[PDB]
Each structure stands twice: as C-alpha cells, then as structure tokens.
Ligand binder design. Structure first.
Ligand SMILES: *[C@@H](C)[C@H]1/C(=C/c2[nH]c(/C=C3N=C(/C=C4\NC(=O)C(CC)=C4C)C(C)=C\3CCC(=O)O)c(CCC(=O)O)c2C)NC(=O)[C@@H]1C
Lengths: 162, 172, 162, 172, 162, 172, 162, 172, 172, 162, 172, 162
C-alpha cells in the first residue's frame, strides 16, 4: 500500500540499498504532516453521517432524474437510495484512510483500481460522485492545513473520476 | 508491504469501519515517538558494516567448522554469500523498524528462507547465531545514551529485538 | 542525481502519475531538514582546510608506513602527500554536497561509483580513507542535528569503503 | 534529472569547488520559499483534469479543423492521444515546479517532441496554443489569493510561466 | 484494419505461410455474406438522416435532463444539439463501414479505441449512445439476414459502451 | 484445440483408419445444422454485457455477503475481477459452441481454475451460481423464437447447457 | 489443430475478444465449402485401395531403381514394398482428413512436422512421394469443386515435399 | 493492412462521408468477381514451389555470374537466402491478390527492400528479373483455361501483373 | 560440469589438501592413455548418423507397436523426436567419454529424463533398448582393430559401456 | 569462421576475459595437429582432379539412373555432368579448407548452411554426395594421422548429409 | 572473426580455388613460428594489470588536465571507465596477436569507437597516447630475452606494434 | 569448472553439436601440455611448506607493520600469523589445482569469486598477497616449460588482485 514510508522502503529495496538520509527525511516529513492529516481524519470521521447525508442530497439536487428515473442504477427506490448512501460513505471513509496512512494507497487499492470498469458495467455516472465529493470539500468545516490535507485527497478522487 | 498506519487501515477496511478515537490516539502516539524511530534506523544503518563484520568474525571464531575446508562458509564465494545474507537480513530488519511493521521483512526476506537454506545445505541454526549477534550490537548502538537527547527508548528497543528474533526463528 | 526531490519525481514518473500528497510530504521533510543540513555544510566548508590538514595527519599517524614506504601509491614524496591531501579534500567536499542536495546523490555519482576499482587499480587502501573520515567526524565541531546530518553522510562514506 | 540544489552542486563539482557563502544563501532562500512551491504544485495537480479538459475544449472551439473528419484530433484514438499529450506536458511541468529546475521536463518530455509531431503530422503550433491555455489556467489557480496565507508568489509565478513557455516553444 | 480478408492474411503471415485453403474458405464466407451486408449498408445509408434524427430524439425522450441541464456536455444549447446529432451520425456511419468492410475494424479503429477516455473526459454518458443505437436497431426497417448483419454491428457498439 | 471435425479426425488417426460412412454422415449433419449454431453464437455474444451484468446483480442480491466489507467481491478491484471472470467464462463457452467441442473451454479456461479460486479464497460455489444464471439467460436469448426462421434448436440448446454445466462443475 | 473454426477462435482469443461477425463469416464459409470437401473425402476414401495401388506403381514406373536397388530404403523386397504402400496410404488418408476438417491441420500435425528429418534420416526421396501424389491428383476421378478441394490438399503436400 | 473494401472505407472516413451508390456498386462488383480471385490465389499458391524453382534455374542460366564463386548466390547459404526471397515476394504478391490492394505487399515486403539489397551487395536488377519470371509463370497458371468454368479473367490478370511489376520496380 | 581432473581437484579441495603422489600418478596415467580416448570419440562421432539410424530401424523392427498408428513413434513429429532423443543421448555419452567423467551426461541429459518420459507416455524401457543397441555399435566402431596403431583399449571400452548403461538405467 | 583459434578467442570474449592458459593450450594443440592436417590438405589438393573424376564415376556406378533419367537435376546431359563434377569438386575443396583452418568453419559456412534447402529445392539426392565422399575417403591414399584428419572432415560432411 | 588461416581460406573461396603450394608454405611457416606467438600472448596477458596501470599513471602525469575537476577522467566513475577502455583495447590487441589477424580487433573493438568518443567528449588523441604507452611496455615484455629460449621474434614484434598502431589510429 | 576439456564440451553443447575435430585438437593440446603442468604441480606440492613459510616472511619483510599493528586483520598475534600462513597455503594449493586441471577453473571458483568482497570486508590488503605470490614465482625452483606453467597461474592470481 502506497504511503510515504512504504515508498521510501521500496525505493531503497529496488536499489538493493540500506535506507539513507534521503529516505529518512521523507518519513520525517510524513510524521510532521501527520499532525494536520490526523486532525482532518478525526473531524471527517466525527461528522461523517452529516457529511454523507448532505452529500447524497447534493447529488439528488444536482441530478434530480436520479430520484425518479426507473432502473436499479438510480436512487428512485429505497434500495437504490441505500446503495448511493453506502457508496458516498465508502468515498468518505477512503479519504479518512488516506489521511491516516499519509498517502493515496488506501483509495488506490480499495476504490480506484477497477473504478472505471464498475461505473461502466453498472451504469453509474462519475459526475454523481464528483458532486458528492465537491459537497464534502465545501462543507467539511476544516481550516488551515487540515483543510489542505482533506482537500488534497478529495480532489485526488475527483481527478480519478474525471 | 504495510507500515503501522496501513496495517490499521487494512484491518478497518475489512470491517468497513471508520477508525475509533482509540485507534486515532494510538497512531498519533506512534507519530509522537517518531524521532526515536528515525534515530534507531540512522544509528543502525550508519554502523551496518561493522555490525555485520563483527558478528561474522565472532560466528566463525565460535564455529570454526564453518570455515574449515568443506564447511559451508569455506571458499570466498561462500564466504561472500554468507556476509551478503547477513547484510540482507540486517537491511530488511531496518526496513521493519522504519515501517513499524514486520510485513516487509516477512514477505521479501523471511518467507521461504528456511527452505532455501535446507536445499543448499546451509546450517540455519548458525545463521540464527549470526542474527542474534547482530541484534545485540544493533540495540547497543541504537540505544547508546551518548550524543542524543535523553529519553526512554525501551519500548522501541523491545520492538527492534522482536524483529531480529523473528528473523532468527525463521531460519533456525 | 539522487535527492529527496528527484526521488519523489522519479517515483511519480515511473508510475506515470502526477505528484500526490505522498510525494509533497517527502519534499517538505527535506525542506525542513535543510536547516540543519545547511548549517553543517557551511561549517564544514568554513573549516575545510583545518579538517583536511588534520585528517591527513591522522592517517599518517595511524599508518606511519604511508610516510616512508617507497612507491607512488604512498605519501612518502611531496607528490604523494599532495595526492592524499587532494583526495581527503574530495571526500569532505562530497560530504558538503550531500548536505546541500539533501541526499547521497553527489557522493554516489562523483566518488562511490568506480571507487572499488580505483582503490584496487592504484593500490590505495580503503582503511586510509576510513581513518580520515573518522577524524573529520570526531573533530568537525558540530552539535545537535547539524552533527547528525554531517555524521550520516560521513558514515555513509565509511560504509562505502568497508 | 537535477533539482535546483543538485544543479548548483553539479556546477561546483565541475570546478572542483566548495560552495560560496552567496551560493549557500541562495539555496537557503529557496528552502525558505518552499511552502509556496508546494502550494503551487498541490493546487495545479489538484485541478489537473479541468485544466486539461477546459484547455482542450477551448482549442477545438477556436480550431475546429482539428476535429473535422480528417483533422488531426478526429477519431477517438487521436482525440485520446491529444488529451494524453496535454496531461503529459502538464505533468512534467509540475515536476519542474517541484524541482525548481527544468531538466526533468527537457530530458523526459520536450527533447525530440518537435520531431515526433513532425513525423506524425501533428500541428505543433496547435499544441503550443493548448499549452498556453493550460499555463494561464494553472497560474490563475496556483496564485488564487483565496484560501491561503497571504503573501507574494510573483517570482514563483514567473518561474512557472517560464516552464510552460519552454514547453510551448519546444513544440511550435 | 480488421476484416475477414486481412485477418486471413495476417494469420498466414504470422505463421510465415502462403495462404491455404483454410484461409480461402474464410474469404469466400465473407464474399457470400457481403450480399446481406451490402443490402444493410445501402439501406442504413439511404435512411441515415431520418434514423439519426429519430435516434437523437429517442435519447432526449429517455433522458429529458439532457435537453435542459446547464453545461456544454448536454444538448441544452444549439451547439450541444449539433454535437449530439454529429456523434449519432458518426455511430451510424461506422455501422455502415463495418458492413462494407465485413468486420469490426472500422468501428474499432475510428471510434472504439479511446472511447472510454473520451466519454470520461468530456462527461458524456454511455447510456445516451446506447439508447440511440437501440432506436436505430428497432427502426432501421431491415428484415432477414440484412437485419442480422446490421444488428450484429449495432449490438457490438452497445457492448463496447457497456 | 479441437473442433467437432478435428475430434473425429484425431480419433481416426490414432486407429490409422479412414472415416466410415456413418462418420461422414454425422459430420455432414453437423454442417447442415450449422446455421443454428451460428445464430446461437451471434445471439449470445450480441447480448454478452447484459448476460454478465444481470447475472452479477442477481448473485450479489442473493449473496450479499460477497459485497459486504471483507467479502470476496468487495472493493472495486475484486468486483472488477469477478465481472471479468464471468465475461471470460461466457467467452470460452461461446467458443465451445462455435467449435462444437469443449476442448478450448477445458484447456484454456477450466483446467486449474478450481485450484486458482482455492488459493485466492474465492468461493467457487458462488461462481457456479453466477455461471448457472448466465446459462439460463443465454439459452433464453439463443432460443428466442422471435425474429428468426422457425425450427427446432432443442438438441443445440442441450449441448449449450452442457458446456455451461461443465464450467459450473469445474469451479464448484 | 488448424481448421477454419479453430483459427477463428484462436484469433478472437489472442485478442482477448468475444467472437465477432468477422469470425462467424469465416465459419459459414467453411460450412458451405464442406459440401464439396465432403464429396471429395468420401470419393477418395471409397476408391482408396485402387488409388494407393495405382500410385505405388506410378512411383515404381517413374523410378525403376526403387524396385531393384539393394537397401532397406527401397521397394526391392516384400517388406519395402509394404512400407511404401503403407506410406502412400498415409498420404491419402491425410488428404481425406484435411478435407473433413476443412484445413491443413491434420496433415501439418501428423505428417509434415518432422517430414524433412524423416526423409533425410531414412534416405527416402521426396520425389517418390511427389510422383504418388501426382498420380492421385490425375486419377481420383473428381470434377468440379470437389476436384478443386482434393487438388488443393494434394498440391499442399507436393509443396511440402519440394 | 487494407483490403479493397477497407481502402474505400478509409477514404470515406477521412472525408466524414457515407458511401455513394457508385462506391457501393464498385464494391458489389468486386464481390461478384470474387470466385475468379480465389481461383487465381489457389492456382498460384498450389504451384508456388515450381514457380520459384523454375524462375531461379532460369535466372542462374541467364546470369551465371550469380553462381560462380564470389557471386552473390554462391554458397548454399546465399543460394538459400535467394530462393527464400523469391518465395517471400511471391507470398506477399499472393496476399495482395487476395486483398485486392497492394498495402500488405508495400508495407511488409517492399518498403526498405531496395536499401537492404544495397547494404548487402545483392543485385536488385537481378532480383527484378526473377520477379518478372515468376510473374509470367504465375499468370499462365492462374489464367489457364483448362479445368475451370470458362470466363474472362483479363482484368484480374492485369491487376496481378501490376503487383508483380510493383515488386520488380521496388528492388531494381 | 567436471572432467576427470576437476573431479580429483574438487575432492581434494573439500578436504583442504594438496594431491598425493598416487593421485598425481593416476592423473598422469589418464593423460598417457589420452590418444585412445580421442580415437574413441572421433570414431563414434564420425559414425553418429548410422549408429542412430541403424539402432532405430532395429528397435522398430523388434517393437512394431511403436510405429503402428497410435504408437509412441507414429507420426513424423514423434518419429523425429525419437530420433532426436537418440542423437542427444549419444551426444552426451560422447561428451562423457571425452571428459572421463559422467557429470555432463548426468546433469544435462539424464537427470529428470525418466519423469519426462512418464509425463509424455513414452516407454522408457524401449528407449533403453535403443541405447543398448547404440552402445554395442559404438563400441564395435571405437574398438575396431583396423586402421589404427595396435594396442589395448579394453579398460576404455568398459568405461564407455558404463556410460551407455548409466543412460539406459536412467530411462528404463 | 569456426577454428580452434577463433573458438578460443570467442570463449574469452564471451566471458569478458583476457586469454588464459586454458585457451593457449587449445591453440598449441591446433598448431601441433596442423602438421598432419597440412599433409592431408596438400595431398588432397595435388590429387584433386583424379579424386573428383573417380568420385563422380562412383556415384554414376552406384546410381545408374543418374546417367539416363530425363531432368535437369540428373547427370544425363553434358550440363548435368558438369554440375555434378563441379559440386563434387566443391565438397573436396571444402575438406581441404577445413584441414587448412583446423576446423569445420569453412564447410559450415560455405556449404552446410542451407544444404538441406538446396537439395530439396533442386531435387538433388543426399545419397549421391555421400557416395562421392565415401569414394574420396577410400581412395585418397593417405595413411597415419593425415588420414585421420582427412577422414574426420569427410565423415563430418557425410553426417551433415544424413 | 577470422584468424590468419581462415583469412587465406576466405580469399581462396571467393575465387573458387584450391590453395597453391606457396599458400600452403606460408601457413606452414606460421605454424612453425607458433611457439613465439604463444609466448608473446602469455607474457603480455600475464602483465596486463601493470601494463594498463603504468600507462594510465604516465598519461595522467603528462596530461594533468584529464584528472583536474571537470576533466574527462575526473570522478571515480570516469577514471574507472578510462581504465576499463585501456584494458579492453589491450585485450582485443592480444586476441589479434593470437589470431594473427586484426579482424577481431577491428570488428569488436575499433569500429565505431572514434564516434563513441566524439559523442561522449572523450579526447581520442589522449586515448592514442595511452595505447602507444601500452604498446611500448607490451613489446618490451613480450620481447624480453631473459627466461626464454633464444631466437628472433623481430617479425612478430613488428606485427604486434602494427595492431597497437591500428588501435591508436582508430581513436585519434 | 573451467578446464580445456569442459570448455570444449560446453562449446559443442551450446551449439547443440557433437564434438568435432575443432574440439578434439584443444583436448590434445591440453594432454600434451599436461606433462609440463604436472611437473610443476608436483614440484610446488613437494616444496609447499618451504614456499609458504618463505612467502609469509617475504610479506612481513615488505610490510613490517603487518607484524606489529594492532588489529585482528594483521599478523601481530599468533592467531593472525596462522590466518596468514593458511591463506598463503590456500593460494599455493589453488595454483597446483589449476596445473592439475589444466586451467583457471579451480582458482576461479574456490578463490577469485568473492575475493574483492572478502578483502574489503575483512580489511585484508591485496598487496600482501601479491608479494607472497611474487616470492613463490621467484623461488619455486622450476625451469623450462614447467616454470612457464607455474608462472602463468601465479601471474593470473596477481592480476586478479590488481
Ligand atoms: C502563492 C503560491 C500564494 C501563497 C502561498 C503561501 N503559502 C504559505 C504558507 C504555507 N503553505 C503550506 C503548504 C504546504 N506545506 C506542505 O508540507 C505541503 C504538502 C503536503 C503543502 C501544500 C504550509 C504548511 C504553510 C505554512 C502554514 C500556513 O498555512 O501559513 C504562505 C506563507 C509564507 C510561507 O512561505 O510560509 C504563502 C505566502 N499565498 C498567497 O497569497 C499566493 C496566492
């Protein structure tokens, strides 16, 4: 899983080398940034339900047809509303994992690998998820470098859907 | 490969769960202890050549059968392979120290090593002796109170010893 | 040339990826550590002549035969004394470059690649250079994290000679 | 590949010289400005998909010949290759921003690209238009005064514009 | 470009072999099927405008938001309506080319390669194009083996979008 | 790989024999039935995406444990691998239909697949359910009386079901 | 084994693709040609003994030394006459198999692979077998496209011996 | 590689156009003439070994310098390479006949061949003589009125001669 | 791979010992007998094609089941593989003769061959018959008293027979 | 070209090594054997015409059909007799070259590479050339190690034809 | 690659000729002189490390610009490459001595080397100086009258000097 | 293990070929040279103790610091004197093995592979061993081609240390 620490180790290992100061600096950078990352991860977790609930409604407001159009890919049934809330919760959970791990690895492995195939197969629109992520970014309530951390991983997900 | 943070994330994902406050606290504490971990890696790595060479010299003094003609470390090719293995094991142990997790050591170094030594005829028991010698020297170097801001690294040294013992158990 | 910044870029590039937060943290770690690294580099530079002169004499004291034995590989002539002082100055200069660059790249490229071949071809003993480096480490006059930085690269060179 | 620090080291090594006080000062100043550089890279990268897509849409609106049947960006394979090139060039420009040196952009992206486009029949002049559009959008995003500690990034924006202009000149 | 004839040649050539009876039979099969394929291609061409016009309206009826939602990816402006009619005409033209060539090569090379990237980049929904293709299949007016030919390539496009 | 004709030839060659009149008649009858076989392959292939997607959706509705966090089809990478396997199995079944012989399916798809799923932890019993769902949908599509010259395809549908059942038995 | 059907499948499989219309046409061509191929295969089988017997004598007439020269590679003993009749029967049997299978696969696998090595090792002259094949071509009694089918595979064997 | 049908499609796509009635008619006529094309390919291929060997024997009889010691076709390795080239050129010409388009011959055989022969010292003029001999024999075989349903293949023979002449011009 | 000299060296190195006078004498005697060894290798190799072909013809005459349709040496591909194996085994036996040590034969030819034949269905007992036939012919050729300086090669012929018997035992 | 000297060099070069005593011994063996090899080469050259003339007649006596059968591959015309005498002279010339060079390289490069293809293409029987070579071996008039040398290369050619 | 014997054979084959008595005599004379050639190769090779190192030290003493910072042999990587080139050139010269023909040196070492040095910026004139120094030392060693059966090696030394001069001319 | 015989076999085997005269000559060269090689090997063995004892003292005389300097890598203790005598005996034993085997294989495999790593790791100077080897060369008492043989392998070892 890609984190600053596993990337540092993997670099040394690919070169058949002991860790050098070059790599220890990278890990120190991660340890220092973790103060902001952990603040963001705790806040997003503490407010996860309101963020998920608000984000789903932002999608339905942007794309009203998702609430009315017939088909199991839409949120026009209780089952589809529950799938959508589940998925949005998955995205938010992955953001918190990236913050905890200090890199994109969790989202890369558990969500982005295969993402295009799943959205095409099940007829899920990437724009729906982009709107949910934009809502989370706008409304997470963070400031300072905690906001910078959260937004980096939210924008990473938006880029992956674009 | 996992580090200590990825390990917690992986366990949480298999449950589909956000982290708890206690889990956040435990990872914040690892970060707060991070300077000590960097010092240990720096100190061990910076002395890697003598850790290996001193441990090797001591092994061959205690176990002269390894270097007698016909022994497993006789000939320069076999001696060089033996020294290389010691360097490799020390290298992967230091990776585990940096990561705070043994996965890199288990996956890239220890898994299958016992069977390798059995196919070659290399005495894994003697490798374990060399590993234990490197452990003692590496901990004495990492935990040297001179030239460093005073504080308690005892938990970290126990973790370090665990990685060395894991490697010794995997070959013996 | 290996620095924390070029390693971060090379990782992204090998993966065909834009830089992510994973890599920006590594560079921040380098920028923060550079305060100590630059203090060490300036001090070693300011005192370079006395360190080189003292280090050469430490070698001659440890290995007196290098001052008397006949042969162009030894320091028993003015030309050989000058070669040895030159070489020790090369090592110290490379340490300062590693400190400036934040990693081992300068020493790797300009000194360590080919080192074993040169020492064998010209009959130069690695132990001579190890002793010079030990003298520099003992006597550079640094404290705190500046000393940690200098000693990391000095010990890296000693390991390369061992 | 060089970063700004390695570049100074390389110049000094070719002269066999330790660094001067002025050279140390210049590199210390780059470090002191480093937060701004990280912000610029983060901001551009975090908006990479829209920088590319908006610039592409604008290019094809101004240059409809590229998308008419027979044009160089007609068919989905050629459109995808064109979008990919825009992403590649933006990616290598951001690497140069992080490094504070154009070597990675020159060596891994720009060298030989003009000849590639000539062999394919791709209009390098039109690529330069796309690059200039990405430049303007990337600088507006990187230098947005909202949501960031106020300060002067004008020198950095001039450096960023230089990398984009270098890429545009290399293809045109 | 993939046709039954170029595939037969490419097979012989990969094996370093002259054409054998094995390959000549494949080409005869293509020549015989071309009677039905050409009937389909001529009919789809003769009725191309009404098929394109009807197909676009089928999309707008299935997905009414495409006629009203703000954004250049939608058909809510004259420019967007023209892009959509253009694209549907591209699909139909590619179907006729496959029929003329006796295989999928034209659609593979000119439309399917890069399709996923284009739809994701420009936020175009695959479902829109699937509906247009379903309309063409339902309403091309062909019967017998000409219909089988047309529908094979229309369904191939639908599969590529799924 | 063998088709139905090569299979008869291979059996005859092992005996060193020319074909008998009955064997010629049996192969002539396969040719006379060939249009139906082509229709079945065309119809199944032309509906491959919905056969797969409908069967997958139904599997996960009946077996929600597969998609709960920790389940074998949880995460998009595992979901994509599962859908891919369904497409692969359907693809090789259609090859067997065209050939009139299961050898391509056995050799290139089914042999070793049970052991693959056991090493991964994938529940082969659940794969068999997905295969059976694809079977039922594919036969309903291939044997649809609308839009085709009327005639009896019952023998062919039994053959098709056999290939699907063979795949389901190989993984379960 | 190479037939039009296995080649069509192998093409799709090498490309990781479902069969397309491109491949189904090739198989239809094979099914249609099989009418002529099966007529040829049945006729050659029904008259196999007279064709083999006549072909062997054609060889002995063209190359009289094969009936008199001492050596086990020649037909100057009962055992050698039986080997030669056996071999000619093998060739004719392989022709019928190619006709049944619709391609060269049977002859390629059971006879042509290793042919040059066997003829060199056992000192068998390719010209002997060419003459037998020419006799079969001249005297099989077929007309129309059945003759075209038989002669394609007979001439394929002659080419393999040349 | 293009066949005659793909060539028309490619020209139309570059214009963004559906085919015209005249273009449909021209391709329908190619299909209606297809049996003759299959006969020509079958007949030439079925006589490939003698077409090559007779043309080679005649070349060396007319140009004995090629086989004298020191000549370009002296030694069995060079003779075998020369025969191989003749087989290769005939093979690619027959591919062009089947396709009704020279692209496969141009792209996979003729492009760069002149420069190959110049680097080796092979006399391209003599290769052209061999090609012309194969042309005459192949056309006499393909257009033999015996043993085939009578009809006019003159247009096809002119097309076939064109492919051979194209190959001869490319090497001479 | 070892020759007879390297074998003695390897045994001595494992003991850390210089050679004894008796060991020197034994190796000097091998050198003094070397002309006979060269003659045997030359004679066998110079007749390799007939040794193989005669042994093969005799095997198939005694064991007609191998060449009947369905038999392991039926079809030209299997016949060619069988002849190839005979040539390979003879080749490695001659290498062992030149070396005065079986290691090359054991390591590069015989090890794993029994399992290869079992996986294929090849009757190793019949291979052993072919090997024994080659042995008898090769020894008769190598030990032919005509056309060579008279002397006693009986020890060498016993050594040669041993290598053939070793190969026959390894496959049977 | 394969000789003991070029093989020794090629071995050292493949290993990136200077020549060692291991290789110089091989060359000394060649220089010592060259006494016998050169005796054989001179004798075969001096008697080349009678050997070629006698060898051709041995072929015609063993295979009388080669003197009477119609076809340009046979020696039943003046042109064919001249081709056959030429070819036999080529074989003998190659034997002398192998003797001069101390190895098989000349025959390998100028005659054996492509041999099977030429004999198959032009319908030349390997047995004809084997008989010519057997005649040369029986009648070259050499004794001792010169005979051993000549016969090694003659038998090498026979093996290549078998 | 050719040796002196293969060169004569190749010239004769291009003429289709048996060797003349004079050509046989010339090759017999090369054999008769062979011991001297073996001595020269043995002596040069046995002193290769000092030939290279002494020549390198002398070059850098005469041409200190090569080792000053910025010079082409400054840094250990460039110094090692320079020493390697000297070893390579000496190695290929000794191959030419053993072969009695320069083809191996020309084909595997000298061809293209001038262009290599020009692309790198390596001063070929300085390489030629190093080669000439190795020449003088190698000839003095090969032609040392002590410790060898007395005789005249002057022709051989002229041949050896020619190979060194050929290498020096190829780089300068 | 590299000897002239295993190199000859390995060449044939890499080419998939039976041994030819090219290779048998190389082995004859080895058998003839073995007379001198065995004389050298027996003499060096018979006088091994005096050669080892004299060689060690030559090293101590050339490099007096090795007898006095503190450290386990030096011969300033009984244990270090015994290690040095052991090592010199290893070198001499390897020379005799090369002579017995007719090539460098024994020394390559048992001593030279890993040599640089061992000398660097244990801080053993290559110059020490070079001096021991020079003493053996000067004082082995051989003449003629036996001396040439011994000196070839002694100088090979010196080159490996340089
Ligand atoms: C021009 C770019 C605009 C601008 C920049 C600006 N930024 C800061 C201060 C900070 N920027 C960061 C950003 C990061 N640190 C990291 O480690 C990473 C990678 C994970 C990033 C993205 C940080 C931590 C700071 C310090 C804390 C803070 O938020 O202030 C400044 C202040 C001066 C300085 O250099 O620190 C400035 C000026 N401000 C503008 O107005 C430009 C539009």
């Amino acid at each position: 899983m890609k984190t600053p620490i596993t990337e540092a180790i993997a670099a040394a290992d690919t070169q058949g080398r002991f860790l050098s100061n070059t790599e220890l600096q990278a890990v120190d950078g991660r340890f220092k940034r973790a103060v902001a990352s952990m603040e963001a991860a705790r806040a997003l977790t503490n407010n996860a339900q309101s963020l998920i609930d608000g984000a789903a409604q932002a999608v339905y407001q942007k794309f009203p047809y998702t609430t009315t159009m017939q088909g199991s890919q839409y949120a026009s049934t209780p089952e589809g509303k529950a799938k959508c809330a589940r998925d949005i919760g998955y995205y938010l959970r992955m953001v918190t994992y990236c913050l905890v791990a200090g890199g994109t690895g969790p989202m890369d492995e558990y969500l982005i690998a295969g993402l295009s195939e799943i959205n095409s197969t099940f007829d899920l629109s990437p724009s729906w998820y982009i709107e949910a992520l934009k809502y989370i970014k706008a409304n997470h309530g963070l400031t300072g470098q905690a906001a910078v951390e959260a937004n980096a991983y939210i924008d990473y997900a938006i880029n992956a859907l674009s | 490969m996992l580090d200590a943070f990825a390990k917690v994330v992986a366990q949480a994902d298999a449950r589909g769960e956000f982290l708890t406050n206690a889990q956040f606290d435990a990872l914040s504490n690892l970060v707060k202890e991070g300077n000590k971990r960097l010092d240990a890696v720096n100190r061990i790595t910076s002395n890697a050549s003598t850790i290996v060479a001193n441990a090797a010299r001591a092994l061959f003094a205690e176990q002269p059968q390894l270097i007698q003609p016909g022994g497993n470390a006789y000939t320069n090719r076999r001696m060089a392979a033996c020294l290389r293995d010691m360097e490799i094991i020390l290298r992967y142990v230091t990776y585990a120290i940096l990561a705070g997790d043994s996965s890199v050591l288990d996956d890239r170094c220890l898994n299958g090593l016992r069977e390798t030594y059995q196919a070659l005829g290399t005495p894994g028991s003697s490798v374990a002796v060399a590993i234990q010698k490197m452990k003692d020297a590496a901990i004495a170097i990492a935990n040297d109170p001179n030239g460093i801001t005073p504080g308690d690294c005892s938990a970290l040294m126990s973790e370090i010893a665990g990685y060395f013992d894991r490697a010794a158990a995997a070959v013996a």
